[PDB]
Design a binder for these strands. Structure first.
Ligand SMILES: Nc1ncnc2c1ncn2[C@H]1C[C@H](O)[C@@H](COP(=O)(O)OP(=O)(O)OP(=O)(O)O)O1
Ligand code: SF4
Ligand SMILES: [Mg+2]
Length: 1114
DNA sequence: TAACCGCGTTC
DNA sequence: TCTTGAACGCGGTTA
C-alpha cells in the first residue's frame, strides 16, 4: 500500500542525499561492553549531528520505521546513520483487577497491526496516593511502523466512543472486556520526537555512531561548522502589480557561501556583463562577489542548481523564501521542464513550506517574526538590518527594479547583492547560533525549532522532563463548547490579567524642579524597617553576611541622614530623578515561588501545611438570557433546513455548529429583549496549590529562567565595560556594542519562550491546562505591583505603571546608590529604592510552605521559605514625556518616551511611529517632536520650543501641502495598512482597509487580492461629502497609472462625472488630516502642558471644551 | 454616549 | 493541522 509508495520515496530521498554526499554508514559490529568512560576504543564513527528525519527502511515485507540522522564528521566530510524504534502508545483501564483480561482482548481485536504487547507502570499525577510511590498500570502497544499504529488507533476510537455514548438495555431485570478500556494515552506524539526523547539525541551535539546506539561525546562541546548558503532572488513583475509565477521572468539570483559571495544574472532581461566587485558595508561583513553572467532563465536556474550540488550545503537560508523566493523558482522551473526534487532535493510539504532532507531551509522571516522582539513595523529586511547589523542596506523601489534592468543595471545588481549579505550575515550572527543551540535542548530538527510556536517549544521541553521522570503524559485539552453560569450561556470566561495605570502626564527632566508632597508616616516606616532592609541586601541579594562587612553602621548612619532630613521638609521643590523599577522575570518567579504548576492545582476531592490556598479573579462575559429563553430558540432553530458542507436538519448538524447557530440566533434575541448582549461579572475564587506535587513543571520553568538569567547578566557586565572605556577607541567601543546587541537579543530571544511557560497553561490543546494557575499568577503580580505603588506614591510620585513596572520620580535629595565594603578587597552594590521595595515584598510574599523531597526512598519531605521576586532598577534617566488623553481626568497608558543622560533616545513605546502602517505624517511628526523636549531651560520654555515644530507641521496641512513636492507628498500622506485575512472573510464588516481593498480589486484585477496580508495604502477623499470616511478611501496607487482609468475610477467614488482635476491636492480631505494631526498635538503637547500649568503653546489647536471650563475656574 | 470591532502594540 | 496569555490605544461603526 503506502508502505510501498513510502518505501519508494526513501529510495528517491536515499539517492538524493547520497548525491549530496550523505552516505549511509553502518557501524562495525562489537561484542563488547557498552562502556561510557572510554568511547574511543569502542569502534564507530564520530559525528556532529546536523539534522533528523523520520523515514521507513527495509531489512538490513512491510517497512520498519526509523529516523535518518545526518552527520558532519571531524575529517571535513559527512555521513548518515539510521535508528529503528517501535512506535507505541498505551491503554489505561478502570479496574486493575481485570488488567490481564483486556490484554487478551487487545491481542485478538488488533490482530493485523499489533506487533508487541507489554504491561507497564507509570506515575500518573491524576491518581490518589501517587506521592507515596503508587503507580498506574498500562498496556504498552508497540508497532512496526507508524502506519500500523494509526490503523490500531482508528480501530479503538470507535470502542472509546461506545464505552461512553450509550448503554444498550436488554434484560431490564438483570462484564464485557471491551468496556474496560477507559482511554488511550501518548497516542498523538510525533514519531521523530518520540525517538529523540527515548534515545536522548539532539541536533548540535556530538555523537559516536555505534552498533548499540549513539554515544554522546561529552568531550567536544563546541559546534562543528556546516556549509551555509543564503540567497535572494529578483524578478520582473509588471508595473503596479505583485509578480506572478506564470508570466514574470527571473532577472538575477544572488547568494553567499561560507563567506564568499556569488551572483548569477539573466542576460535576456539584464543588459551588461557585470564584473567582479566588492560590497562590504562594515569590515566585519565581507562581500566580494564573483558574477556568473548567464544567458537564459534556464542557464540561470541550471547554474544555481549545479552550484548547490558542488558546495553541498547543509543549510539554505532565505528571507520570505517559503512564500515567494522558492515557490517562484519551482513554478518557473516547471514552466521550463525541470524537477527541483530530482535536481536539488527541495519540495513543498503539507504546510506549503519548502524543505529537503539533507539541507535545513532557514527562513529568516520566521526568526524575526518570533524571536527578534522587533515591532511588526520593523520586520522588513531593511529595518531588520539597521537594527541587528549596524549598517544601512541599499533601498530601491520595487516599481523601478525591472525598468532599471535595462536602465542602470550596475546598481540593480547592488540591490540583489545587498539583500544577500543582509540575509547571510543576519543568519550567521543571529539565526544560526540561536536555533542550533536551541536544538541542543529541544528534541526537534533545525527547520522545526525555527518554525514551531513558542508554546509548542514549551510543550517539547516539558515532555522530556515528563518522560525522564516516568510521568504519564496527559492527553491534549479540549475546551467545552458550552459553558454556563447562573443559567446564562457564556461567551468567554477569563481571569483578570496584570494591573496597568497611567498616573501623571507631561514632561519631566533631570534639570527642571518638581514638587513632592511627602507623607511623613511613610518615612517613619522606612525608619523602622531600615536596619533589616540593609541586612537584607547584603544577604539575600548578594550572597554574603554583615560579619564580613567593614562599613555597615558607617552607611546605615550615612543614609538615615537624608531620610530624617526629609522628615521635617515634607514639601520640597528640587530636581527629580527619573527611575524605573521592574521585577526580573515576574511571572516565572511567581510560579517558582509558589510551586505553581497545573498538576499542583487540586480540588477538595484530590487530597499539615502542604495545601497553599491562593486567590485568583474569574471574569465571565455571559448573555443576559435564562435557560427558559435558551430553550425557546433551539426549538425555532430545529425547524430550519441548513446547508451541507443537500440540506440537513438541525439535529443532524454537528454539535459544534449547533451552538454556532444557537449563538448567532441568541446573539440578536438577547439584544432586542434584554437590552444588551454581554454582561460582565468578576468573582474572586480561591484554589489550593499542593506544595508536595511532582515539581517537574516548575523545575522546567526554573531551569529555563536560569538559562536566560545568564545572558541577561552578561549584557549588564558588558554595559559596565562600555562605561569604563575611553569614548574613542573604535574597535573597543564597537566590539562592546556588538556584544551588547547580541546578548540583549539573546536574552530577549529567551524572554518570550520563558513567558510562554505561563501562557501554555491556557493554550488551546495544552496537555497541562488549568485556568486556575494563570489567574493566580496574575493576581499575585497585581497585588505585588499595587503594594509597590502605594509605597512610592507616599515618598515620590509614580508616573506610569504596568504589570510589574513602575515609572516614577523621586526628589534628588532621596538616597540613590551606595556600595558596601568587604575585607576581601571588594565591594557590594546597593540602590536603596530597589531594596526598600525588595525587603517588603520579601515580607508579605515569601512561601513558608515550599516543600521539597530530600530523601526519596522513605518519602520524606522538608519545608523551607522560597521567594525569588526581586525588583530591578534602571536609570537615572534625563527626561520622560508622557502623553495625556483628550477626555477629562484620564491619561493614556502603554506609551511614552524616555531619554538617556546622553540625550540618546532610550525607550520609545506604543506611539504611532513605532506601530506598523499608520499614516506617515503622524509618524513623521512624532519622530520630530520628542527630540526638542530636551531643549530649553524652563518647562514653559520646553513647550514653546516643541511648539515651533508643531506649527511648522501645521503649515503643511494648512497650506494644502503646496510646499512639499508632488513626490515627497504622496509618502507623507500615505496610510499603509495590513489586512490579516482576505476580503471575503470580512463580509459585513466595513472599515477603511476593507473598501480600499475592494476598490483596488476592480482596478488592477482580482489577482491583486488573492492572498492575505495585503497592504492597503490609501488616501482619504474630500468628495463625496455628507458621508462616512469608510466610503472615501482612494487606493493611492492609481495616481501613477493611465489617465482615463484614473478619471473613470476617481469619478465613480467621488460621484462627480467631470474630471475637474487629477492632482492629489484636488481630492484629499485636508480637514480630516489636520484633525488627525490636531489630536496628536493635543495628546502629546497641549493637554500635557495644561495639566502641568502652562497655557496653550499651540493655540491653533483648540483645547477641548472640558479643559477650557477647567481653566476659567482657576 | 457607549459598546464593539480589527490591528498592533506593552506588558 | 497548528495553536502562549491579558490589557490597552485608536480609529471607526453600531445601538
Ligand atoms: N509574550 C508574553 N507572553 C506572556 N506574558 C508576557 C509576555 N510578555 C510579558 N509578559 C507577562 C509575563 C511577564 O513576566 C510579565 C512582565 O513582563 P516584562 O516585565 O516586560 O518582562 P519579564 O518581567 O518577564 O522579564 P524582565 O523584566 O527581566 O525583562 O507579563
Ligand atoms: S495539599 Fe496535601 S493533602 Fe492535598 S493533595 Fe497535596 S499533599 Fe495531599
Ligand atoms: Mg519585568
Amino acid at each position: 500500500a503506502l508502505s510501498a509508495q513510502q518505501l519508494l520515496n526513501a529510495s528517491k530521498i536515499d539517492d538524493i542525499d547520497s548525491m549530496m554526499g550523505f552516505e549511509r554508514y553502518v557501524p562495525p559490529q562489537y561484542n563488547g561492553r557498552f562502556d561510557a568512560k572510554d568511547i574511543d576504543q569502542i569502534p564507530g564513527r564520530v559525528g556532529w549531528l546536523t539534522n533528523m528525519h523520520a523515514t521507513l527502511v527495509s531489512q538490513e515485507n512491510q517497512g520498519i520505521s526509523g529516523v535518518d540522522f545526518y552527520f558532519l564528521d571531524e575529517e571535513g566530510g559527512s555521513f548518515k546513520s539510521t535508528v529503528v524504534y517501535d512506535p507505541y502508545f498505551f491503554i489505561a483501564c478502570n479496574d486493575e483487577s481485570r488488567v490481564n483480561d483486556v490484554e487478551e482482548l487487545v491481542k485478538k481485536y488488533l490482530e493485523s497491526c499489533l506487533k508487541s504487547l507489554q504491561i507497564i507502570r507509570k506515575e500518573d499525577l491524576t491518581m490518589d496516593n501517587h506521592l507515596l510511590g503508587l503507580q498506574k498500570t498500562l498496556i504498552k502497544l508497540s508497532f512496526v511502523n507508524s502506519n500500523q499504529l494509526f490503523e490500531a488507533r482508528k480501530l479503538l476510537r470507535p470502542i472509546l466512543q461506545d464505552n461512553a455514548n450509550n448503554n444498550v438495555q436488554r434484560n431490564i431485570y438483570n462484564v464485557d472486556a471491551k468496556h474496560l478500556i477507559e482511554d488511550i494515552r501518548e497516542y498523538d506524539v510525533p514519531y521523530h520526537v518520540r525517538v529523540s526523547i527515548d534515545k536522548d539525541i539532539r541536533v548540535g551535539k556530538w555523537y559516536k555512531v555505534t552498533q548499540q546506539g549513539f554515544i554522546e561525546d561529552t568531550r567536544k562541546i563546541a559546534f562543528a561548522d556546516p556549509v551555509v548558503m543564503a540567497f535572494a532572488i529578483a524578478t520582473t513583475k509588471p508595473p503596479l502589480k505583485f509578480p506572478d509565477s506564470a508570466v514574470d521572468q527571473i532577472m538575477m539570483i544572488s547568494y553567499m557561501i561560507d563567506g564568499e559571495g556569488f551572483l548569477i544574472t539573466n542576460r535576456e532581461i539584464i543588459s551588461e556583463d557585470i564584473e567582479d566587485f566588492e560590497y562590504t558595508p562594515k569590515p566585519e561583513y565581507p562581500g566580494f562577489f564573483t558574477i556568473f553572467n548567464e544567458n537564459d532563465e534556464v542557464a540561470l536556474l541550471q547554474r544555481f542548481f549545479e552550484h548547490i550540488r558542488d558546495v553541498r550545503p547543509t543549510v539554505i537560508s532565505t528571507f520570505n523564501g517559503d512564500f515567494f523566493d522558492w515557490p517562484f523558482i519551482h513554478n518557473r522551473s516547471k514552466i521550463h521542464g525541470l524537477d527541483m526534487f530530482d535536481e536539488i532535493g527541495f519540495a513543498p510539504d503539507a504546510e506549503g513550506e519548502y524543505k529537503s532532507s539533507y539541507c535545513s531551509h532557514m527562513d529568516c522571516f520566521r526568526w524575526v517574526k518570533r524571536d527578534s522582539y522587533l515591532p511588526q513595523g520593523s520586520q522588513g529586511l531593511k529595518a531588520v538590518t539597521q537594527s541587528k547589523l549596524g549598517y544601512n542596506p541599499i533601498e530601491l523601489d520595487p516599481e523601478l527594479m525591472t525598468p532599471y534592468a535595462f536602465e542602470k543595471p550596475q546598481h540593480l545588481s547592488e540591490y540583489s547583492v545587498s539583500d544577500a549579505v543582509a540575509t547571510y550575515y543576519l543568519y550567521m550572527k543571529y539565526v544560526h547560533p540561536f536555533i542550533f543551540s536551541l536544538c541542543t535542548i529541544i528534541p526537534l530538527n533545525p527547520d522545526e525549532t525555527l518554525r514551531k510556536g513558542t508554546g509548542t517549544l514549551c510543550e517539547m521541553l516539558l515532555m522530556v522532563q515528563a518522560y525522564q521522570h516516568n510521568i504519564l503524559l496527559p492527553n491534549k485539552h479540549t475546551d467545552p463548547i458550552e459553558r454556563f453560569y447562573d443559567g446564562h450561556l457564556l461567551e468567554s470566561e477569563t481571569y483578570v490579567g496584570g494591573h496597568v495605570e497611567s498616573l501623571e502626564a507631561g514632561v519631566f527632566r533631570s534639570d527642571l524642579k518638581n514638587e513632592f508632597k511627602i507623607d511623613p508616616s511613610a518615612i517613619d516606616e522606612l525608619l523602622q524597617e531600615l536596619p533589616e532592609a540593609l541586612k537584607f541586601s547584603v544577604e539575600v541579594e548578594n550572597k554574603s553576611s554583615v560579619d564580613k562587612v567593614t562599613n555597615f553602621e558607617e552607611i546605615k548612619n550615612q543614609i538615615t541622614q537624608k531620610l530624617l532630613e526629609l522628615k521635617e521638609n515634607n514639601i520640597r521643590n528640587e530636581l527629580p530623578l527619573i527611575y524605573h523599577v521592574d521585577v526580573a522575570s515576574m511571572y516565572p518567579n511567581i510560579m517558582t515561588t509558589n510551586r505553581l504548576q497545573p498538576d499542583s492545582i487540586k480540588a477538595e476531592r484530590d487530597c499539615k501545611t502542604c495545601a497553599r490556598k491562593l486567590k485568583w479573579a474569574w471574569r465571565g462575559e455571559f448573555f443576559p438570557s435564562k435557560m427558559d429563553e435558551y430553550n425557546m430558540i433551539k426549538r425555532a432553530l430545529q425547524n430550519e433546513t441548513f446547508p451541507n458542507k443537500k440540506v440537513l436538519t438541525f439535529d443532524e448538524l454537528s454539535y459544534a455548529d449547533q451552538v454556532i447557530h444557537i449563538k448567532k440566533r441568541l446573539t440578536e434575541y438577547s439584544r432586542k429583549v434584554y437590552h444588551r448582549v454581554k454582561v460582565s461579572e468578576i468573582v474572586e475564587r480561591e484554589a489550593i496549590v499542593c506544595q508536595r506535587e511532582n515539581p517537574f513543571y516548575v523545575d522546567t520553568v526554573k531551569s529555563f529562567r536560569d538559562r536566560r538569567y545568564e545572558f541577561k547578566g552578561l549584557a549588564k557586565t558588558w554595559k559596565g565595560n562600555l562605561s569604563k572605556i575611553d569614548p574613542s577607541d573604535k574597535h573597543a567601543r564597537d566590539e562592546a556594542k556588538k556584544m551588547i546587541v547580541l546578548y540583549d537579543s539573546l536574552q530577549l530571544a529567551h524572554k518570550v519562550i520563558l513567558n510562554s511557560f505561563y501562557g501554555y497553561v491556557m493554550r488551546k490543546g495544552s496537555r497541562w491546562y488549568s485556568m486556575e494557575m494563570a489567574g493566580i499568577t496574575c493576581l499575585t503580580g497585581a497585588t505585588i505591583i499595587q503594594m509597590a505603588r502605594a509605597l512610592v506614591e507616599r515618598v515620590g510620585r509614580p508616573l506610569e505603571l504596568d504589570t510589574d513596572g513602575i515609572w516614577c520620580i523621586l526628589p534628588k535629595s532621596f538616597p540613590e546608590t551606595y556600595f558596601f565594603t568587604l575585607e576581601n578587597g571588594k565591594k557590594l552594590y546597593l540602590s536603596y529604592p530597589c531594596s526598600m521595595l525588595n525587603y517588603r515584598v520579601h515580607q508579605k510574599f515569601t512561601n513558608h510552605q515550599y516543600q521539597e523531597l530530600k530523601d526519596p526512598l522513605n518519602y520524606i519531605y522538608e519545608t523551607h521559605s522560597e521567594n525569588t521576586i526581586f525588583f530591578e532598577v534602571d536609570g537615572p534617566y534625563k527626561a520622560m514625556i508622557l502623553p495625556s488623553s483628550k477626555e477629562e481626568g484620564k491619561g493614556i497608558k502603554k506609551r511614552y518616551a524616555v531619554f538617556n543622560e546622553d540625550g540618546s533616545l532610550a525607550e520609545l513605546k506604543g506611539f504611532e511611529l513605532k506601530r506598523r502602517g499608520e499614516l506617515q505624517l503622524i509618524k513623521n511628526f512624532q519622530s520630530d517632536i520628542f527630540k526638542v523636549f530636551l531643549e530649553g531651560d524652563t518647562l514653559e520654555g520646553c513647550y514653546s520650543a516643541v511648539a515651533s515644530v508643531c506649527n511648522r507641521w501645521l503649515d503643511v496641512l494648512d497650506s494644502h501641502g503646496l510646499m512639499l513636492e508632488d513626490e515627497d507628498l504622496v509618502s507623507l500622506i500615505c496610510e499603509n495598512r495590513s489586512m490579516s485575512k482576505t476580503l471575503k472573510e470580512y463580509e459585513g464588516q466595513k472599515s477603511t482597509s476593507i473598501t480600499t481593498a475592494r476598490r483596488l480589486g476592480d482596478f488592477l484585477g482580482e489577482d491583486m487580492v488573492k492572498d492575505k496580508g495585503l497592504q492597503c495604502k490609501y488616501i482619504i477623499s474630500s468628495k463625496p461629502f455628507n458621508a462616512p470616511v469608510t466610503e472615501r478611501a482612494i487606493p493611492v496607487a492609481i495616481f501613477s497609472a493611465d489617465i482615463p482609468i484614473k478619471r473613470s475610477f476617481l469619478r465613480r467614488w467621488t460621484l462627480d462625472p467631470s474630471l475637474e482635476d487629477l492632482d492629489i491636492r484636488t481630492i484629499i480631505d485636508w480637514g480630516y488630516y489636520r484633525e488627525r494631526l490636531g489630536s496628536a498635538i493635543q495628546k502629546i503637547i497641549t493637554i500635557p502642558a495644561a495639566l502641568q500649568g502652562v497655557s496653550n503653546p499651540v493655540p491653533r489647536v483648540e483645547h477641548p471644551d472640558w479643559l477650557k471650563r477647567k481653566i476659567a475656574t482657576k
